[PDB]
Amino acid sequence: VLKVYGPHFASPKRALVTLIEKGVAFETIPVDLMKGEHKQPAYLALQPFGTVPAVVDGDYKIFESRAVMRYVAEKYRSQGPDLLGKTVEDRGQVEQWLDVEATTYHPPLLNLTLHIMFASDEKLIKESEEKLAGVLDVYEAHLSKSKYLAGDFVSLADLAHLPFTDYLVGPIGKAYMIKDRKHVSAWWDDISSRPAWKETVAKYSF
Template sequence: MVVKVYGPHYASTKRVLVCLVEKGVEFETSPVDLVKGENRNPEYLALQPFGAVPVIQDGDYTLYESRAILRYYAEKYKSQGTDLLGESIEERGLVEQWLEVEAQNYHPHIYNLTLHILFASALGFPPDEKLIKESEEKLAKVLDIYEERLSRSKYLAGDFFSLADLSHLPFTQYLVGPMKKEYMIRSRKHVSAWWDDISNRPSWKKVSLL
């Protein structure tokens, strides 16, 4: 069964794609053009009532919210491909903790930067310079905490690569690439080494070319 992934070939959809590559799960993508508003079409809203991306269909099973999809495949194929949940319930607890940190503390700021620096003109609104400045300051504080954490363990949840690290890939790639804010990563020694490690994984090299 080939998993069908609905979403644009960027942003949170790539969070799901890199997970599927790590787990060795075959997929096909069905593009959804957010700029054209295809995520507000009735057919799409029948799949995802909030109009967000991505959504997967796996046989007759439909699931949305990227981090829920990550957890589903990491658990469904626990012993296939890279184990992304840790070996014990305690390790999984820490994976969940750092996945929540990504969602609640890291993502809101990097999302604001991405939206206002990279997508504002395509979406037809002026970038909010005050929000950009505040978001960079808040993200810097979060990265200071990451720096301390990553001085004590190779990855966020411990000495194993997990969903918590993987979930950072798509938007951090925007930060170091098109947003030209690589200095935020490179000015922090342990964050920098972590980024080199996770962004050089073959799975991400494959997905970042899509």
């Protein structure tokens, strides 16, 4: 059975929500980051960068949360929603917005997340919020003409935004970044209410 390491943290929930969306059986294994368990040789053999998640599926091992999403969505492509889309063109749009999350949306969000948890670099915080807001403005324009990021179907690209945006509008206290943008807000309301996400949060929150 597929095993996911570090379910209580945010990046692993990208994989968990995908697993739950595809109806794939899995177990989770905690990793004690606060006591540095992830920097010890045992976990480093699973994830050489010492970060979570790592996934072991029998003899097969894979890390990087969005790679795991792609692996699960391709391996179990025929069951559940097709989170990769149907055509090569569809998958292209999915890969596109997934990389937008990885390279453009997530990094400034992570900086706000970390540096507001540090109360810190107040210049970095101001820059990170503005960069993120700039990204959300693009999303806003895009989502006003497209139901989901990759098209008229929900995909890995959308699911990838769930764990850290949830943090953003919750304990970080910046719900206005989502709320003040009408189309983004409706999109967020839609994907964050999907049963797979509700189950992920109910089961694996701090």
